[PDB]
Write an enzyme that holds these catalytic residues in place. Structure first.
Site: not given
Lengths: 313, 313, 313, 313, 313, 313
Positions: B107, B109, B188, B221, B223, B225, B227
């Site tokens: 990513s 970003r 997030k 997703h 992981k 954390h 979203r």
């Protein structure tokens, strides 16, 4: 939010009172005049710019040391003044009345919005003088009719249904007397027709408010329309509405209060509103605003999940 | 969202691979080169500006006829390239590996955000080189560690709790590869610590999401954390996450999927996520996303009314 | 590129249908309305701004989440709407017809260009109402006449001959519905007269295209004019034109296809066009577009060298 | 395009000539000086700003009444002057030589471009002082080496191949001595290596020129690189190149003329160039430029159709 | 400085030629037309914008590759065209004449200046149509009358006397066809009346020219007015004026040359002018321009000292 | 044009007077101080910004009610103050002297110009501290040396000869104390060397002044340089210069007056200057300025015609 005598003065000419707009420069001269306590309530004569408002209404005009008033030097002031004059002049007013009529405190914002509607070729008020007048007379408090969509003060339409129309009040952008708090956000929902409304349409409107406006209380000030105010504000709308009912202690203040659909209005507001309409002290009413409850929280329980589901697809 | 080989090239010098950043002008020359099919996968040699990326990665760079790529002529490109080089160079990479490492799609970003964190004196990454590296290695997919608050990609903090930190992803404002859809809004929530979290803290976080983010789905997703995506988007996050699990059909793709607190995650997402983690076809999983349900809708039933009540006062 | 019912609504007044333009604010209210599936195909009534388009045509108007539509709040929208109304109103339309007429999908760009022609004092359409109408009726698909120079949609003249006129389509600069791809470049060549054209004039036109437009395919969409599109686009013009012929599976869709001078039109396009006009599947036609050939490559072999030589001197 | 003595003056110090840059203010004083015919060829002494150029070179500097010269008050002038000094100073010049060296007329544009290359960190000249010098000495006409890609004057790369590099000459944007004709467009193709070039690579380069530059003549001025000039200009490049060969009437003017690949160079230019290299009058040579021909027009007959076909797909 | 046929075309309507202005867009189409050598001298027909000028006059209009012409897309072009049409239309022109009249080459600057005079309410031409016409007919070369103050082309008055009026020609600021050389400075002195002029008035005018314009030659082009050109220009005014007299080799070119007051005109110019008016070759005349002399240098010897002395006090 | 004590104050430190610059804020505090008549001539002590100038010098600083002074808040003020301090500090000044030295009235413009010379890398003063000091000491009136080219105050060079240098005084553009009259134009001619000057060089200089500066008087103020003032000003330069000679009535005012070349200086000025240098009353001298004369008007009679002739060719 000032007295009507802040925009015009009565002139008994051609056998009847015809109201005339003030020149801002005349207002400006007034603001510098040394006046006697005996004349604070009289119309002022600048010599150069015609008649000015009663010196007692000084606080209503913004100056180097007042931001609590209005911006009378703007073009909008003249427009609103004319808008008022055009309305009051269609009401062949009598002597004993001129005084009371002009002391009527009204919403300047409501008036600026109507000017914005009537000056726009796309809006119906631009074409119907009759409609514009009904609307103005309602806003000037010189009419029995209730405000509806057709005669609404205006704003941006952010939702329209077969039965309702939701407007975003553009107060921050006003020229004459803007809301100064940049955190301000308020909407109002008007009825397109006073006839009966199906559960279908009410449900749609309740769903839109629950999803797109979850952080807003759904109340009303007694007239026939809903006001979408954020919860951090209801407490003050409470003080305000009550103080107005309080002024019932003045015959002629016939105050029929219409507490709209109990399924639409916010639960607590229905409570607070009814205790008041019953004759209780502010404190009794007020308390109901903070007392958490439970029922009537599921009028159409399920609206929320539905909209959400529609989004998912 | 391109391959690592889009920012640098390997240089086996001083007895080990040291990665080097591309000059944008070299990339620009590459973009005009006539190359043989046999070399589309090889590093290009402009003569004037050093080595350029493999001609096959042409689609990754914005041009007069491509807005699907990145803005490699910006300063941010150099920054991100360096950020990557600094990380890969701390990973004494071996021959058979350089290839795979560089083909790792990542990513951009996420990388631009870390550059924004490390360049700011107020941010911890500015002072800890060790922290900056853990963070970068996580983002480059060359680390087993899970991303947490301390090593988060960054953004604006709009809520922080003893256990969580919510960030607003500033993608619209990115220089290198911005989200082009102005309707974009995503957040997030990262864990401040991996240790146990009291019901007190979870409840607070669930309340904030229910009141301030009512129109957002709470997913993840895989992981560690959360979203916060708007419901009009979950369907695609579904396709995406599934396709990634789908790529499990490639040993080494050890994909432990962590479906976070079932009381926090959106009901349907917990469903969809578990069917997948169980071995079902996309269609089986997918359907659960749209099937309206009821239970697990009241984990902490009452949070909503409370916040509202606090506002009223 | 929307339906005619996207600019106006029928009003059977004074004994015949007279079409009326929409107010953009009415369109804006429509866009926020909650409508029943049963009425998506009906004209909408905002109350404040008159009638609005059928809610089903929502996708035709740009919004915060749609750039695929048009900019109905521009002045050009009103202009184009009026341009259409002026044309449809000269066509005393009957009941059973209004429906079909309004569902006619047309080129908005073509309409914006005519507005640009008629508003300019230098252009003939400014002075001839008759000419402006023939032109508009052609563009609205309510006319048998073929478009020629005199009645062309417009643009910049970059070549004119005794027999032809080449225009540069200014789509990028449009206000209502601009082409968004900045790489866009297209021209069209119209016939000044439908009478016979000498080999002298054809030769001149073929020379200009070969020298000044070497990177452009010379095709046609069946009407009586050439379209100068860049080769990287022909494939799509193919899909498009074929799909239109495909819609021949609808009596009334009398589709006479005019495949212009075989010496002017691009070789492959003549092929592809004829296979289609013969009754072959898209695949059969399509293939001819890519199959390299040889002959008919020297209609006027030598034009190229000549122009070049003239430049040298 | 002035004499080297227009940027610096010789100073025999520390036992050898070291060249020094002029201050623009010194040039400015010179421009106002009344000088004797006997000193027009001598270096001028302003008193305030050091030595100035020989008053005879007045026409080389733009003034209120001269746009045919250069902009010596720009920063670029100092840069170019230094660039020259750095080069001439590495050439331990002897007395009898300083004169000739400085009278060498050179291309200022060529020099401004090298400054643009050396000041850029991405360009190889920025890092190699040796390379920068070879390049400068070539441009100053004080070197036997031929200019190649590595040592090219510079510009924008619009095509690069294993064997060639095509640059767009940015003359319009120059600071020191810009081309004033906004219609100006010129490119040059340099060899990446002097070694043999396969037919594969030549073919690619010939294809790019035929498709992307159809309106340009492919010529050369004798050095080892191609010049892509538009046909409306070849005639003048002819006059120019011939006049230079004409100056062969001056021993020491050893003029080896390299007429590059006959399959790349424009047919007529190969003709004109060879007649000259043979010893014919300008008129004999010149005529061949306009005499239309036929053969050698199909070196790689078919390149055109191919590129076109690739576009179609 | 183009032919009259560059601004309008003849239209024999209502029994006589009435001249009509061109639309710039029509001129623009003409500029792109492929025309036969046989029609280069004929009026062009764009189809969209009316008649255009004869294609042979191409060089008269500025384009992307011509700055030697005029700016026909400016508003001034239309104005000047109308100004001309209004004048030619008052001259009931006959067939055999239209041709010659339109081929008359005239000064566009002279015409732009008259437009500037007539559009200004303060100027007499604004009020007198008769005056404006005499002035225009003089400038169009369709009048025997000589230009005087009252009918001057215009400019800024920098000196006025009982007998003369000095104007500064504002050519640099023109819209249609401006002088491009920023060093340009020219004035002209017109006679307020053609009657005799006292020595008093001549003396004043000679003094002003000697003190305020010492660096200017005082000449004339044969008409009845002085032209104040800087000496660095006389040589060209010489070539020009002579070439015009040279065109005397064309009966009808009746060229009465008025060499104004010998005490005002520059000595050498009087010489050069008389040799010409006598029948000598350019070379004979020309030489007198450079041959230094002595006499007639003291017509009013002493004027200089006087003005200076007046300044001292 | 104020006293040196307006830029600095003496500080007898480290066994000798070292002059120190004022802070503008200290000057600003002084300007508001109430001071006793007994201290108007003493250095002021603001407490916050150090020592300020003597309150009596109030009129020397521009304020809301004074434009006759200087702009002490500019950067130039600090620069000039430092420039002065650097000079006075190299002159180990003694007690009895500090007073007189600081009361020396000097030209601020002259000082601002030297700052402009020394800050420029191209100017010799930038490199020679010795030169800068000679120049400053001359301007501060603390030096016997005469000002020459090398040590000139500065300005724009508009003519330079083997013997002279003409500068345009840029007073209008000054930051510290600009000439306010926009009609101001003055030049000065300095000698490049004090050695003898050939008639050749004088002649050149006299020619340039006669042609390019015909409206300027050529005078001098007694020092060794010419001043090119317009005639409308000589009268005042007269009053001024005489009043200075008048101040000869003060031993120590040794005033050697150098009336430069009688062939260069203006006739009348030579007269006026000599009568003064002889001991006559202002009136006697003055009269000679207005009395027209004749002789000495032809020192190099013919210069004028020559330059003119050169222009013609």
């Amino acid at each position: 939010m000032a007295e009507l005598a802040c925009f015009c003065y009565p002139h008994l000419e051609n056998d009847s009172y015809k109201f005339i707009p003030f020149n801002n420069l005349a207002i400006k001269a007034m603001l510098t005049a040394k006046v006697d306590k005996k004349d604070m309530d009289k119309f002022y004569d600048s010599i150069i710019y015609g008649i000015a408002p009663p010196p007692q209404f000084k606080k209503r005009y913004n100056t180097n040391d007042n931001s609590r008033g209005m911006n009378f030097e703007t073009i909008m002031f003249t427009k609103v003044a004319m808008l008022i004059c055009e309305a009051l002049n269609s009401l062949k007013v009598t002597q004993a009345n001129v005084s009371n009529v002009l002391s009527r405190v009204v919403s300047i914002r409501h008036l600026e919005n109507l000017v914005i509607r009537k000056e726009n070729p796309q809006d119906i008020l631009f074409h119907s003088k009759d409609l514009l007048l009904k609307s103005t007379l309602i806003a000037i408090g010189q009419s029995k009719e209730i405000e509806t969509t057709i005669t609404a003060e205006g704003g941006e339409i952010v939702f329209q249904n077969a039965a309702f129309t939701m407007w975003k009040l553009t107060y921050l952008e006003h020229q004459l007397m803007p809301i100064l708090d940049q955190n301000f956000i308020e909407y109002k929902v008007t009825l397109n027709e006073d006839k009966p409304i199906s559960d279908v349409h009410v449900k749609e409107l309740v769903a839109e408010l629950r999803w797109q406006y979850n952080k807003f209380a759904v109340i009303t000030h007694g007239k026939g329309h809903y006001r979408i105010v954020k919860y951090s504000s209801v407490a003050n709308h409470a003080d305000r509405v009550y103080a107005t009912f309080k002024s019932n202690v003045k015959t002629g203040v016939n105050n029929d209060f219409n507490l709209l659909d109990q399924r639409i209005i916010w639960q607590n507001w229905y409570a607070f509103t009814s205790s008041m309409k019953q004759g209780n002290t502010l404190d009794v009413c007020k308390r109901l605003l903070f007392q958490k409850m439970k029922p009537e929280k599921n009028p159409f329980k399920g609206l929320s999940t539905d909209r959400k589901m529609d989004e998912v697809s």
